Curated annotation (Swiss-Prot), chain A:
Residues 151-175 are annotated as: Disordered. InterPro entries: Ribosomal_uS4 (IPR022801), Ribosomal_uS4_CS (IPR018079), Ribosomal_uS4_euk/arc (IPR005710), Ribosomal_uS4_N (IPR001912), S4_RNA-bd (IPR002942), S4_RNA-bd_sf (IPR036986). The keyword Glycoprotein does not apply. It is found in: Cytoplasm; Nucleus, Nucleolus. Its main location: cytoplasm. There is a cross-link at residue 171 (Glycyl lysine isopeptide (Lys-Gly) (interchain with G-Cter in ubiquitin)). PANTHER family: 30S 40S RIBOSOMAL PROTEIN, 40S RIBOSOMAL PROTEIN S9. This is Small ribosomal subunit protein uS4A. Component of the ribosome, a large ribonucleoprotein complex responsible for the synthesis of proteins in the cell. The small ribosomal subunit (SSU) binds messenger RNAs (mRNAs) and translates the encoded message by selecting cognate aminoacyl-transfer RNA (tRNA) molecules. The large subunit (LSU) contains the ribosomal catalytic site termed the peptidyl transferase center (PTC), which catalyzes the formation of peptide bonds, thereby polymerizing the amino acids delivered by tRNAs into a polypeptide chain. NCBIfam families: PRK04051.1, uS4_arch. Belongs to the universal ribosomal protein uS4 family. Residues 98-172 form the S4 RNA-binding domain.
From Swiss-Prot, chain B:
The chain holds residues 256 to 357 of 357 of the full protein. It is found in: Nucleus, Nucleolus. Residues 93-102 have a biased composition (Basic and acidic residues). The lineage of its organism: Eukaryota, Fungi, Dikarya, Ascomycota, Saccharomycotina. Present with 1430 molecules/cell in log phase SD medium. It comes from Saccharomyces cerevisiae (strain ATCC 204508 / S288c). This is U3 small nucleolar ribonucleoprotein protein LCP5. Component of the U3 small nucleolar ribonucleoprotein. Required for the early cleavages at sites A0, A1 and A2 of the pre-ribosomal RNA. Participates in ribosome biogenesis. Residues 46-102 are annotated as: Disordered.
Swiss-Prot record, chain C:
Present with 10600 molecules/cell in log phase SD medium. There are 2 genes for uS12 in yeast. It is found in: Cytoplasm. This is Small ribosomal subunit protein uS12A. Hydroxylation at Pro-24 affects translation termination efficiency. The stereochemistry of the 3,4-dihydroxyproline has not yet been determined. Component of the ribosome, a large ribonucleoprotein complex responsible for the synthesis of proteins in the cell. The small ribosomal subunit (SSU) binds messenger RNAs (mRNAs) and translates the encoded message by selecting cognate aminoacyl-transfer RNA (tRNA) molecules. The large subunit (LSU) contains the ribosomal catalytic site termed the peptidyl transferase center (PTC), which catalyzes the formation of peptide bonds, thereby polymerizing the amino acids delivered by tRNAs into a polypeptide chain. One of its GO terms (cellular component) is cytosolic small ribosomal subunit. Component of the small ribosomal subunit (SSU). Mature yeast ribosomes consist of a small (40S) and a large (60S) subunit. The 40S small subunit contains 1 molecule of ribosomal RNA (18S rRNA) and 33 different proteins (encoded by 57 genes). The large 60S subunit contains 3 rRNA molecules (25S, 5.8S and 5S rRNA) and 46 different proteins (encoded by 81 genes). The chain holds residues 41 to 144 of 145 of the full protein. The modification 3,4-dihydroxyproline is found at residue 24.
UniProtKB/Swiss-Prot annotation, chain F:
Component of the small ribosomal subunit (SSU). Mature yeast ribosomes consist of a small (40S) and a large (60S) subunit. The 40S small subunit contains 1 molecule of ribosomal RNA (18S rRNA) and 33 different proteins (encoded by 57 genes). The large 60S subunit contains 3 rRNA molecules (25S, 5.8S and 5S rRNA) and 46 different proteins (encoded by 81 genes). This is Small ribosomal subunit protein eS24A. There are 2 genes for eS24 in yeast. Keywords: Acetylation, Cytoplasm, Isopeptide bond, Phosphoprotein, Ribonucleoprotein, Ribosomal protein, Ubl conjugation. GO terms for biological process: cytoplasmic translation; maturation of SSU-rRNA from tricistronic rRNA transcript (SSU-rRNA, 5.8S rRNA, LSU-rRNA). N-terminally acetylated by acetyltransferase NatA. Also partially acetylated by NatC. The chain holds residues 4 to 93 of 135 of the full protein. GO terms for molecular function: structural constituent of ribosome.
RNA sequence: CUACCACAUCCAAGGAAGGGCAGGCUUACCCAAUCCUAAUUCAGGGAGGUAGUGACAAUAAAUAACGAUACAGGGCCCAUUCGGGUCUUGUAAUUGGAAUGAGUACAAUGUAAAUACCUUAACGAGGAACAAUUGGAGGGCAAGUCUGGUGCCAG
């Protein structure tokens, strides 16, 4: 299949792993947290065979530079964190930190996680040029400063919504 | 300087398809130069689109994440044949290295 | 596998034990007898939750699965290993939920 | 079908209310921190016990 | 309306254009020079990297190296090179081939005057106010609030609130400029520099326009400015 | 209103052609509305209105911008029969 | 095409005739693109495209957010149990302004015709609306029924 569950899908710690992570980050179910953990497991296993080799080895030098360079492009790993084992140290909470649904809240603009999830899926808030409607987007470090409502959105610089105008039309009929 | 794309212009479907991969850029400017030179389009026939879109997008769901590829480190193609000691025609005598550092 | 290589059993209902039992949905009430088609031997079969005993009558070619009890019940008969799962080629719990109907 | 609720029809609404119910349980289990003082009040409000000793013992 | 370009981290402070359909824009606090192909929607990053602990090291083996915090004013001398004005006196000429600056210049309008000993004092002992000046540590540079280039020429004019308009002639190889001199006919906070040439092919009379203000364009941010006469500075140069 | 911008304009003498790609920049409205831009190049270029054929219309996802491709000749009397069958119905 | 040898079909019974595939234990729209071809910018070609027939398996969202009042005083955790902890929680309480698409449903692109098709328009959310489930556990209730008992109990 696409995503892989762990070998046993009920533990004492696992049942509140889904409870804590979904309740604070607005996750829908176990599916996408397991998907990111699937991606992080590929990254951390790729972090292994980088690091079982030595310094001035042709494998550790080239994509070892690249692997930290890719994550500083997406903003998961910090700029000064150019260590080859800090990619082992990062956990599943920092990918969920970089999620756009949680990024909409954390920049302001939302007042809650679920109101951000509503604002994401109601085709409201744009990333620079293009307006996106996915909760999990992996907003990069460079593109994070251009998270704003779309110009064709009522919270932005457009007309008000169809029920505020209808309420304005209904009180106009009362006048 | 590397001619990077804009912030919002990279993404493909607002969602499921990835942000952008550099291989996807390299194919895109090649086919649009083919558009801008030979002045004709090309269709979306299901014989090619069964592979040229589907497993391309299924790879792009799991390899390029956040605009950056990550599945290529988990691949197992060995990187020594294209490299060793920066090229071929390397060592038979002592003179081939003698005029290299000279 | 209980008898062959299969985990299920087509079988002809012969009669209905426990229809003369007094207490409703007791273990003696629920059990019926059924003959497996491949050998003709007669085996006993639980039918759960008495309303579906009211559904099975006579030549229904029922499907039989194992019981898999996790312990001795209040008054259960030990040894009875079979439960009716599908009557006339449709699931018995769906009849108890009256989703479908018994074809004749 | 037995009469279920609107809560089970959506997982995101269910995960929110399950977490907030679990958060209030966590405040009941241990005294978690909340804020500080943006106002005036000095001490506590639920009484001070004498023989309580909520400290773990450093047994050898 | 035609097209919108996106991508800076901080506010875009200045924009410069030419005949070709491309522009360069500069964000301040991210210290980015960003060249765009507007019909192509393609960006070109330019980072700095004036490492201070190595730039002081190469001076000691051969002078207060203020780190840049913003880049304010930008213009292109030609298609292949452009100049940038930072907020630490830095005037960087950037080749379009090189991500690094092909020519780095330190403080152009010098450092700011020292704060007054009795005005930072709060105390009656004069020698403690000399210890309240801290020497070279509290000294701050003059900042490039204006930097304009005549197109396809060798000279560009820099300006600040020193009351000085400094002209810099580049080399024929386009890798280094030197200071020609100072135009001090007006004193105050210059904001924008404009040029006009007129005449024949060789015999070219010049008219230079500079806008002297009492403070910065985007805010007040001013102190101890002397002789801040608002108006237009006119310089007329011949041949 | 809309604005067109011709790029890679190139004249062709043996078949009396000239072709150019065009970027059209919609402010918001709905679409290209291709009857407008053939009128737009009619008053920007000396176009002799029915001699133009715009077919390469690919809109980028998100609206407001479309890369258009078009071809125009001169002398509209022969331009009818130098055209293939699938666009004089336009 | 001719006799020869088999095998069918048609009759007024005198002769004219005659040449298995798909299926199990779909043979429809279409000459634009691309090439070949009658003559062949004109046309032709089972050369090529789209439709049902097909989840032999997998996949991303939505299926409400956001408040304002009034009400009450208990809620929750641990442990066999006496008990021990801990804190603004619970409203089948009213109520407000949002925002949106599920859908309806002009016209404009698209592509050869089309198809999908980007889209526009005008609407479209107050809850029995645009009313999703599946599985597991624990109970309680009758002037109700049955069995065993050492009243009034046990099942």
């Amino acid at each position: 299949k696409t995503y892989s569950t762990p070998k046993r899908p009920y533990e004492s710690s696992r049942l509140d792993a889904e409870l804590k992570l979904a309740g604070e980050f607005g996750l829908k179910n176990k599916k996408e947290i397991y998907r990111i953990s699937f991606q992080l497991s590929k990254i951390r296993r790729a972090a292994r065979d980088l690091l079982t080799r030595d310094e001035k080895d042709p494998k550790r030098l080239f994509e070892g530079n690249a692997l930290i360079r890719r994550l500083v492009r997406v903003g998961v790993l910090s700029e000064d964190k150019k260590k080859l084992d800090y990619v082992l140290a990062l956990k599943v909470e920092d990918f969920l930190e970089r999620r756009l649904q949680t990024q909409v809240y954390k920049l302001g603009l939302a007042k809650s996680v679920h109101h951000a999830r509503v604002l994401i899926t109601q085709r409201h808030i744009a990333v620079g040029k293009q307006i996106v409607n996915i909760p999990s987007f992996m907003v990069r470090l460079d593109s994070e400063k251009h998270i704003d409502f779309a110009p064709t959105s009522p919270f932005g610089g457009a007309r008000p919504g169809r029920v505020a105008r209808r309420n304005a039309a209904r009180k106009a009929e009362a006048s | 300087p590397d001619w990077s794309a804009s912030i919002g212009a990279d993404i493909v479907n607002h969602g499921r398809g990835g942000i952008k991969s550099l291989r996807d850029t390299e194919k895109e400017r090649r086919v649009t130069s083919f558009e801008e030179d030979n002045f004709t389009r090309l269709n979306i026939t299901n014989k090619a689109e069964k592979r040229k879109q589907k497993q391309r997008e299924r790879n792009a769901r799991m390899n390029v994440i956040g605009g950056e590829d990550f599945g290529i480190f988990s691949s197992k193609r060995k990187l020594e044949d294209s490299t060793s000691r920066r090229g071929a025609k390397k060592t038979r005598s002592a003179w081939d290295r003698a005029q290299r550092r000279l | 596998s209980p008898f062959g290589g299969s985990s299920h059993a087509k079988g002809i209902v012969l009669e209905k034990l426990g229809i003369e039992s007094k207490q409703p949905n007791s273990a003696i009430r629920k059990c019926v007898r059924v003959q497996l088609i491949k050998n003709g031997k007669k085996v006993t079969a639980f039918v759960p939750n008495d309303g579906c005993l009211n559904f099975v009558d006579e030549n229904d070619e029922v499907l039989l699965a194992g019981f898999g009890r996790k312990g001795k019940a209040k008054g259960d008969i030990p040894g009875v290993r079979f439960k009716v799962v599908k009557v006339s080629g449709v699931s018995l719990l769906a009849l108890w939920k009256e989703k479908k109907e018994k074809p004749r | 079908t037995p009469k279920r609720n609107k809560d089970n029809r959506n997982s995101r609404v269910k995960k929110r209310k399950k977490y907030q119910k679990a958060q209030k349980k966590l405040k009941s289990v241990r005294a978690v921190y909340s804020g500080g003082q943006s106002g005036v009040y000095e001490g506590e409000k639920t009484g001070i016990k004498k023989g309580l000793t909520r400290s773990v013992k450093f047994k050898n | 309306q035609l097209e919108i370009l996106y991508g800076h981290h901080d506010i875009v402070e200045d924009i410069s254009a030419l005949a070709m359909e491309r522009c360069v824009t500069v964000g301040a606090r991210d210290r980015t020079a960003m060249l765009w192909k507007i019909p192509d929607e393609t960006r070109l990053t330019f980072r700095g990297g004036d490492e201070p602990q190595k730039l002081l090291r190469r001076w000691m083996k051969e002078p207060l190296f203020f780190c840049e915090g913003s880049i304010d004013v930008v213009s292109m001398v030609d298609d292949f090179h452009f100049i940038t004005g930072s907020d630490n006196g830095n005037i960087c000429l950037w080749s379009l081939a090189k991500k690094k600056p092909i020519f780095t210049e330190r403080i152009a309008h010098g450092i700011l005057p020292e704060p007054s000993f009795n005005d930072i004092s709060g105390e009656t002992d004069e020698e403690l106010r000399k210890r309240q000046l801290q020497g070279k540590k509290l000294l701050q540079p003059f900042w490039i609030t204006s930097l304009y280039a005549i197109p396809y020429s060798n000279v560009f004019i820099s300006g600040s609130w020193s009351g000085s308009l400094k002209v810099w002639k580049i080399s024929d190889n386009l890798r280094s400029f030197e200071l020609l001199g100072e135009l001090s006919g007006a004193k105050g906070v210059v904001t924008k520099i404009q040029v006009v040439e007129s005449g024949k092919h060789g015999k070219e009379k010049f008219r230079i326009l500079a806008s002297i203000a009492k403070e910065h364009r985007l805010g007040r941010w001013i102190a101890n400015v002397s002789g801040a006469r608002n108006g237009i500075y006119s310089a007329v140069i011949d041949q | 209103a809309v604005t067109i911008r011709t790029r890679k304009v190139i004249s062709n003498p043996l078949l009396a052609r000239k072709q150019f790609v065009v970027d059209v920049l919609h402010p918001n409205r709905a679409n290209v509305s291709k009857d407008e831009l053939r009128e737009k190049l009619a008053e920007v270029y000396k176009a002799e209105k029915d001699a133009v054929s715009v077919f390469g219309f690919r809109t980028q996802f998100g609206g407001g911008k479309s890369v258009g491709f078009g071809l125009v000749y001169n002398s509209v009397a022969e331009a009818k029969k130098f055209e293939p069958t699938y666009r004089l119905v336009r």
